[PDB]
Amino acid sequence: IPPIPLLRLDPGIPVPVRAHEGDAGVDLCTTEDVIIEPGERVLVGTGIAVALPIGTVGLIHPRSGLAAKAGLSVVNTPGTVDAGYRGEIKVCLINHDPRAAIELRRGDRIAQLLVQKVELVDFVEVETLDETARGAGGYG
Amino acid sequence: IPPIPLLRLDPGIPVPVRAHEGDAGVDLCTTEDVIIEPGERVLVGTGIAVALPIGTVGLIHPRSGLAAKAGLSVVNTPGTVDAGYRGEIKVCLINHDPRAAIELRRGDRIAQLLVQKVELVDFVEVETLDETARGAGGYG
Amino acid sequence: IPPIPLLRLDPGIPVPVRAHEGDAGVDLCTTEDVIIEPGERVLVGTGIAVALPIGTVGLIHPRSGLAAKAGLSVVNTPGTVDAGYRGEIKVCLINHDPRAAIELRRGDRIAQLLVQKVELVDFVEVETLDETARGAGGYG
Ligand SMILES: O=c1ccn([C@H]2C[C@H](O)[C@@H](COP(=O)(O)O)O2)c(=O)[nH]1
Ligand SMILES: O=c1ccn([C@H]2C[C@H](O)[C@@H](COP(=O)(O)O)O2)c(=O)[nH]1
Ligand SMILES: O=c1ccn([C@H]2C[C@H](O)[C@@H](COP(=O)(O)O)O2)c(=O)[nH]1
């Protein structure tokens, strides 16, 4: 698989690497210290820009450990990085703990980045849809 | 790629379109005005139904801008739209800001819809699993 | 498609099944009773371990009904289960309702598990990225 071009915007942030051979994501870091009070959110930079190939999408997922241990998550999760995006990747972090603030230092790992294929499809208006077993059963 | 049949249930909502050639998602709108007080959630309709082909899934992701700027997100994110679903697509919105209510008007864009392949696999019970390097290391 | 080896760690939890032929996910249950007070979170076990093949990822999504009806969600959503993981799958649940606690009993369905392909790519540092129409337009 062709590697993804990565631009290091911040010399103090390492190039992300895959920790185990089949791991879905690579770690993303914050380029700045932040204290996130309970219920508050903050947008931080990751120090990198990428050129994802057309046909793929980058997905920003919360880190599992910080989620369970501190309530740290991502407001717009899964964060959606489009193939044509050439800016710095940013993460919108939120503290879901009711009591304890979260302190993050520059260089701390804050999220993980997955790359997947996406169907670049068009939607064609029709007058009727075919029928299925599941039907209109759903709870939005 | 074969286009996806789309049924317009609401004549006041446009047919979604892909804004740039490789963008992962298309915009979804609310069919109704809502004011979402801090910490509250609401289920809104999008005015469309689709027939996704077997082998794919529709994913409802929060919009990036509204997430960072107002704290708007989706409670069940990523919202999972099954291939056999033939009802109106709905979005369960939540206001994660601690202070400021969010006002959305009919026609406002509230989320984005991605289409991806999904593995329709069966799970076979075994007595033992093979071993790996990562192991049982995880923080749920 | 080759079925996924599943290890039942808890004899009181059923083997997950796909409810309709094209449904994206299978149901995951909690192995324990929990009461989740408003704004609080809890890590529960699902009673199963799996061996996902290299090249895939397991994704833990909130259940749609409980999200809209009770505010139940997943803190690290989408929960990311790596191919090399051989431990018990766990779910970090959170109550986003401001008022009403959520009571879940052992055996209740709490989430859904999807399986998708993931691109196991490397990132190669470059000095410059190519240019696109979308550009650096984004709201993290
Ligand atoms: O954000 C969502 C999530 C689900 N659904 C619809 C389409 C799904 O296939 C159906 C699933 O609901 P349950 O069958 O899981 O209740 O609900 C939505 O409209 N929006
Ligand atoms: O919702 C989740 C997320 C992760 N994991 C497990 C499987 C993952 O591969 C492992 C990853 O945890 P870390 O290695 O990132 O700590 O934890 C879960 O059981 N449930
Ligand atoms: O978590 C996120 C989400 C989005 N983006 C960037 C890359 C996206 O393509 C662009 C999309 O933003 P809008 O064009 O949707 O405003 O923002 C991020 O850096 N981080």
Q: Dihedral sign, CA of A116, C80, C115, B2?
A: negative
Q: Considering the domain boundaries, does residue C16 fall inside one?
A: yes
Nearest ligand, CA of residue B84? 1
Cα–Cα distance list, B75 to A86, B17, C63 (Å): 29, 24, 10
Contact, B98 vs A38, CB < 8 A? no
Is B139 part of a structural domain of the chain? no
Can you point out the beta strands (E) in chain B? 4-8, 26-29, 34-36, 41-45, 48-50, 56-62, 72-74, 79-81, 90-95, 102-104, 109-117, 123-125
Measure CB to CB from residue B87 to each of A20, A123, A138 and give the nearest one. Answer: A138
Residues 6+ apart with CB under 8 A from A74: A60, A61, A62, A91, A92, A93, A94, A111
Task: Give the closest residue to A91 by CA, choosing from A139, A136, A48.
Answer: A48
Residue C14, C-beta contacts closer than 8 angstroms, at least 6 positions apart: C29
Q: Is B139 in the pocket of ligand 2 (CB under 6 A)?
A: yes
Q: Please say whether the beta carbons of B88 and B47 come within 8 A.
A: yes
CB-nearest partner of C78 from A78, A84, A132: A78
Task: Report yes or no on C50 lying in a domain.
Answer: yes
Query: Which CATH number fits the domain that encloses residue C77?
Result: 2.70.40.10
Give the structural domain span for C82: 6-113
Please tell me the distance from the alpha carbon of residue A40 to that of residue C128, in angstroms, as a whole number: 35
Closest CA to C80 of A97, A68, A39, B25: A68
B13-21's contacts with Cβ under 8 Å and 24+ in sequence apart are B13/B46, B13/B47, B13/B48, B13/B107, B15/A123, B15/A125, B15/B48, B16/A123, B16/B48, B16/B113, B17/A123, B18/A120, B18/A122, B20/A82, B20/A84, B20/C132, B20/C133, B20/C134, B21/A54, B21/A84, B21/A120, B21/C133
Q: Cβ distance C104 to C111 under 8 Å?
A: no
In terms of Cα–Cα distance, which of B58, B46, B137 is closest to B88? Answer: B46
A82 close to B (CB below 8 A): yes
Size of interface A-C (CB pairs under 8 A): 153
Whether B98 has its CB under 8 Å from any CB of chain C: the answer is no
CA of C53 to the centre of ligand 2 (A): 16
**Whether the CB of A81 sits within 6 Å of ligand 3:** yes
Residues of A in contact with C21 (CB under 8 A): 133
Is A91 domain-assigned? yes
Is there a domain that residue C134 lies in?
no
Residue nearest to atom 4 of ligand 3 (CA): C140
Question: Which method was it determined by?
Answer: X-ray
Number of domains in chain A: 1
Is C98 at the interface with chain A, CB within 8 A? Answer: no
| C-beta of B138 in contact with ligand 2 (< 6 A) | yes
C82 lines ligand 2 (CB under 6 A): yes
